[PDB]
PDB file of C-alpha atoms and ligand atoms in Angstrom:
ATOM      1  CA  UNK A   1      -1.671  35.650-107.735  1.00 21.18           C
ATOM      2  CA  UNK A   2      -2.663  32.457-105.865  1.00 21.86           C
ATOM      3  CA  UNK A   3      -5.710  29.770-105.790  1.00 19.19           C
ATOM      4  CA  UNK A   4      -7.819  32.424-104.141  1.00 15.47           C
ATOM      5  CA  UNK A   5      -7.621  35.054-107.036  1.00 18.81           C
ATOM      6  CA  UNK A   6      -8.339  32.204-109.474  1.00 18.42           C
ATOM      7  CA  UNK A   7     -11.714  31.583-107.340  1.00 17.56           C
ATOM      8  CA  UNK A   8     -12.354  35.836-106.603  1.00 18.83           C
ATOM      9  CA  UNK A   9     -11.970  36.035-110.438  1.00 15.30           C
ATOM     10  CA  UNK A  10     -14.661  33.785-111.289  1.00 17.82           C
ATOM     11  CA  UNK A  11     -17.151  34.885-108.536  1.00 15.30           C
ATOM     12  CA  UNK A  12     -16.260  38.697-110.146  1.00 16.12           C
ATOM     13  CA  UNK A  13     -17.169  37.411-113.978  1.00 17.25           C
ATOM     14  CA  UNK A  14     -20.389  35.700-112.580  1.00 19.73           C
ATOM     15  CA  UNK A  15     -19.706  32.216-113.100  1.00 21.09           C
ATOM     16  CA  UNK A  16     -21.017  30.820-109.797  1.00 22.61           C
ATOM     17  CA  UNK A  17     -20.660  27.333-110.780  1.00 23.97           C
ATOM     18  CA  UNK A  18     -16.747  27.625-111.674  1.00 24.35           C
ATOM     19  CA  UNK A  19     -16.470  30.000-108.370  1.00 25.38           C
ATOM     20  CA  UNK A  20     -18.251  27.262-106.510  1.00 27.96           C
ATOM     21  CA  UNK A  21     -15.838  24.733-107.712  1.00 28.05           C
ATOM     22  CA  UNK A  22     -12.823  26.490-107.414  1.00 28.22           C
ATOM     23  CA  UNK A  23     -13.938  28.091-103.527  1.00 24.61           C
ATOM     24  CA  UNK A  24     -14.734  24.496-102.545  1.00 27.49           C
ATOM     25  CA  UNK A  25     -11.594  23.291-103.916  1.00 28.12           C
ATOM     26  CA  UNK A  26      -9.779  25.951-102.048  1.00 27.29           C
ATOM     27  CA  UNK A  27     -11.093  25.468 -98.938  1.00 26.50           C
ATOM     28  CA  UNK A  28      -9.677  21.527 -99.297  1.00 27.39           C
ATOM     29  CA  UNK A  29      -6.709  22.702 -99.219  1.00 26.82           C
ATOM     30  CA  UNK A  30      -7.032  25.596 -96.440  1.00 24.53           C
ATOM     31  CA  UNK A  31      -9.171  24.767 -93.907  1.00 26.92           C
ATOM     32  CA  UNK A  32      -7.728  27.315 -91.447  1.00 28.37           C
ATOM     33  CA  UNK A  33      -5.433  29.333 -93.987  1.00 31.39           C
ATOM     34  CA  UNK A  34      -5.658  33.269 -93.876  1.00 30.96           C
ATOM     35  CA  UNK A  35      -7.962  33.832 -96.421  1.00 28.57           C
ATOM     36  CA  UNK A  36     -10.277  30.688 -95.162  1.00 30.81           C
ATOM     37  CA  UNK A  37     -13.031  33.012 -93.994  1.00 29.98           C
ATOM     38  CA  UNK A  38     -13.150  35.022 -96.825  1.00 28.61           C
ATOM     39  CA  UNK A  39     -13.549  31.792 -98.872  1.00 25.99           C
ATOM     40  CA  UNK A  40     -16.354  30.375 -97.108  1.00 27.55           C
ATOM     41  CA  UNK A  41     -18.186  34.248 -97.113  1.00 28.01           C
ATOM     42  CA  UNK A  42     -17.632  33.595-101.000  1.00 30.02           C
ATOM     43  CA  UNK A  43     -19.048  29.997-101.364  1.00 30.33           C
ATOM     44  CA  UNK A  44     -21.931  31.004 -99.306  1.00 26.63           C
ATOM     45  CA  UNK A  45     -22.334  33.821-101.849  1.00 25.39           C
ATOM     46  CA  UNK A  46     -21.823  31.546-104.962  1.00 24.90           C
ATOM     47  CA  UNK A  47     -24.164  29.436-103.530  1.00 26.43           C
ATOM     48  CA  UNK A  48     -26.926  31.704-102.642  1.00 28.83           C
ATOM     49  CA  UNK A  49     -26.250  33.769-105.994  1.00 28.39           C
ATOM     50  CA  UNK A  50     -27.674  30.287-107.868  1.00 30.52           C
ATOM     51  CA  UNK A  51     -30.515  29.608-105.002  1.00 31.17           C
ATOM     52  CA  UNK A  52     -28.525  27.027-103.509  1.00 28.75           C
ATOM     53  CA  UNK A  53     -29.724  27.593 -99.892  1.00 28.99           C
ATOM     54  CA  UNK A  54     -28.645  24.645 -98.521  1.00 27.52           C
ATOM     55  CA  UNK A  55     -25.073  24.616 -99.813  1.00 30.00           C
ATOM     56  CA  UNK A  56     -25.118  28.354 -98.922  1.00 28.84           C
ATOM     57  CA  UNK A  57     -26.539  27.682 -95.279  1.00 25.98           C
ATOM     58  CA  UNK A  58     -23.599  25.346 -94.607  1.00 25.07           C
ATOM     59  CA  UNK A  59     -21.115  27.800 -95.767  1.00 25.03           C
ATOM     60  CA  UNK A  60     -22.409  30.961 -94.089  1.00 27.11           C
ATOM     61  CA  UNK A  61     -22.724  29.140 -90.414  1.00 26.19           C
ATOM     62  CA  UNK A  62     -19.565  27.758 -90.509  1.00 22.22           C
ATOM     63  CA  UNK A  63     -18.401  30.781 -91.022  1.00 21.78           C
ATOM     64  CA  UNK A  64     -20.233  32.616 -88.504  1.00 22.67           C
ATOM     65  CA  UNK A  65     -19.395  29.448 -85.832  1.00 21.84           C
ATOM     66  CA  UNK A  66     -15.574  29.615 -86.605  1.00 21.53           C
ATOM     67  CA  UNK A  67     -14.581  33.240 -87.547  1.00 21.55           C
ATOM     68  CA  UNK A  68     -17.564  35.467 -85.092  1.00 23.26           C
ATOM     69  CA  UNK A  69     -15.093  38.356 -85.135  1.00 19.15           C
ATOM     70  CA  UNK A  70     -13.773  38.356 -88.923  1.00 21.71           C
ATOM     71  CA  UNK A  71     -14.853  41.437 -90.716  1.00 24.65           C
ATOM     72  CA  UNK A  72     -16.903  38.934 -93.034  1.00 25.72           C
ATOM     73  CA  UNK A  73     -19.287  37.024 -89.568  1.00 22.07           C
ATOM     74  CA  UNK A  74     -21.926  40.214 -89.744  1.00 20.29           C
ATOM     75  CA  UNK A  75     -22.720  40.045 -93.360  1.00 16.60           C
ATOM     76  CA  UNK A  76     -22.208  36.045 -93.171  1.00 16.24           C
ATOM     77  CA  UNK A  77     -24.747  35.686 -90.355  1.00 17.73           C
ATOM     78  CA  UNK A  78     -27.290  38.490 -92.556  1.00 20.34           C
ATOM     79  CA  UNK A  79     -26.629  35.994 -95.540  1.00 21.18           C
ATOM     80  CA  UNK A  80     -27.198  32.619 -93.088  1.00 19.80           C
ATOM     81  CA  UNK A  81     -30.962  34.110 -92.505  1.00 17.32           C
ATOM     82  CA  UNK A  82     -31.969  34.740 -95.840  1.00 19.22           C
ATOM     83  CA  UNK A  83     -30.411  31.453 -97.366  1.00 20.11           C
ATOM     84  CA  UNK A  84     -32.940  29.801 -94.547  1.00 23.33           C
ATOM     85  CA  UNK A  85     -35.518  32.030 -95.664  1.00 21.74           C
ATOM     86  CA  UNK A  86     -34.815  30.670 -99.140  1.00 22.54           C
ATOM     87  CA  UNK A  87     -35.268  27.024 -97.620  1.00 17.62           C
ATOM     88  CA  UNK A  88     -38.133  27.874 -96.729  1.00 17.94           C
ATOM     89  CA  UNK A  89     -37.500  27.740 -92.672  1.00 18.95           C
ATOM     90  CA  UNK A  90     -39.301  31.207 -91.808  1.00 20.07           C
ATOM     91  CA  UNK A  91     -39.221  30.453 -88.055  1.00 20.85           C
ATOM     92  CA  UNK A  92     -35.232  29.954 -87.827  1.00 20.36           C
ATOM     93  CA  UNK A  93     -34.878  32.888 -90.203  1.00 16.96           C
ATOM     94  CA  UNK A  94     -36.358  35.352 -88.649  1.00 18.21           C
ATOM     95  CA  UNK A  95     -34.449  33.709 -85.024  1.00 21.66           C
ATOM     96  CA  UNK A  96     -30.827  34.516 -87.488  1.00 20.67           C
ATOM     97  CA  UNK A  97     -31.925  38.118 -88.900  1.00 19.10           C
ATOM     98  CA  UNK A  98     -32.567  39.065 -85.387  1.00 17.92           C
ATOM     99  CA  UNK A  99     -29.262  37.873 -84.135  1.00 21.63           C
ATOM    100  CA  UNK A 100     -27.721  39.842 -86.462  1.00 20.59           C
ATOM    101  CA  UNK A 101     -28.755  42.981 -84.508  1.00 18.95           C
ATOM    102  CA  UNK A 102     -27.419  41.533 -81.368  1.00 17.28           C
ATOM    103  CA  UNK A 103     -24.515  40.793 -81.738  1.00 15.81           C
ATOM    104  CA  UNK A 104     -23.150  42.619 -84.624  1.00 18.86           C
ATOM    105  CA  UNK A 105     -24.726  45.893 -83.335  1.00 18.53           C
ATOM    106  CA  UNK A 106     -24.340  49.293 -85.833  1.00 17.85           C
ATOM    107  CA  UNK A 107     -23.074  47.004 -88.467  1.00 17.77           C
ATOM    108  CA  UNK A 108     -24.209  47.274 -92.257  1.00 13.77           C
ATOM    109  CA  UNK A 109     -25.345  43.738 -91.745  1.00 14.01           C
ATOM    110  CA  UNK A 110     -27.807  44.415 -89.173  1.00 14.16           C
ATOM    111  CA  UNK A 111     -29.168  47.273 -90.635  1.00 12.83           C
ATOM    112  CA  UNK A 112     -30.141  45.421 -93.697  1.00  9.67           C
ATOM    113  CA  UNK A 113     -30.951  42.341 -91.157  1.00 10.84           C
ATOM    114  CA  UNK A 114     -33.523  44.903 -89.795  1.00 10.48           C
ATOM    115  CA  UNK A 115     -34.745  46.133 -93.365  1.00 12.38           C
ATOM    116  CA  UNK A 116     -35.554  42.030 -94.589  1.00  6.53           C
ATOM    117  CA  UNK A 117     -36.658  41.140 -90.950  1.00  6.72           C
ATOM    118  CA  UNK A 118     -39.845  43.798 -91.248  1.00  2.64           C
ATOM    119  CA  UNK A 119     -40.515  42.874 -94.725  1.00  2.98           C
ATOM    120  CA  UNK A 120     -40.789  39.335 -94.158  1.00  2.00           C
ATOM    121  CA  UNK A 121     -42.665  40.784 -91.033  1.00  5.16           C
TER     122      UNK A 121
HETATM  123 ZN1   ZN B 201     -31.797  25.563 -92.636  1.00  3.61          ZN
END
């Protein structure tokens, strides 16, 4: 049990401010650590959990930009369009849904990329 689980832990009981704190603390002190990735996926989802979208948008595309083939970049790139959707930036959202078909092809991500993409329309 390490910094990380303290962070997962509160994310899990659905205290996204603690989780925020405690995934931003973590990724002070691992900026390119194993479980980096997985951190900023989390923020991002701390983040957007509270309609955050700008502190999520920074999380999810430096994810995305860093870590394109982590098993977390799909759903991180799905989670980068709707936090700009949440700001409000339809153009640019719509621009990062559709990327998520392209280059994370037959992922869960794009599928639900898809699904938001026609609804927003
Ligand atoms: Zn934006």
């Amino acid at each position: 049990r390490t910094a990380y689980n303290v962070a997962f832990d509160a994310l899990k009981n659905g205290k996204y401010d603690d989780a925020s704190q405690l995934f931003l603390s973590f990724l002070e002190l691992y900026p390119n650590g194993v479980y980096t990735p997985n951190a900023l996926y989390w923020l991002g989802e701390s983040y957007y959990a509270t309609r955050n979208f700008q502190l999520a948008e920074a999380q999810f595309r430096d994810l995305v930009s860093r870590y394109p083939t982590h098993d977390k970049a799909a759903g991180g790139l799905l989670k980068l369009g709707l936090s700009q959707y949440g700001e409000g930036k339809n153009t640019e959202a719509q621009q990062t849904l559709q990327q998520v078909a392209t280059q994370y092809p037959g992922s869960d991500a794009a599928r639900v990329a898809q699904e938001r993409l026609q609804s927003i329309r």
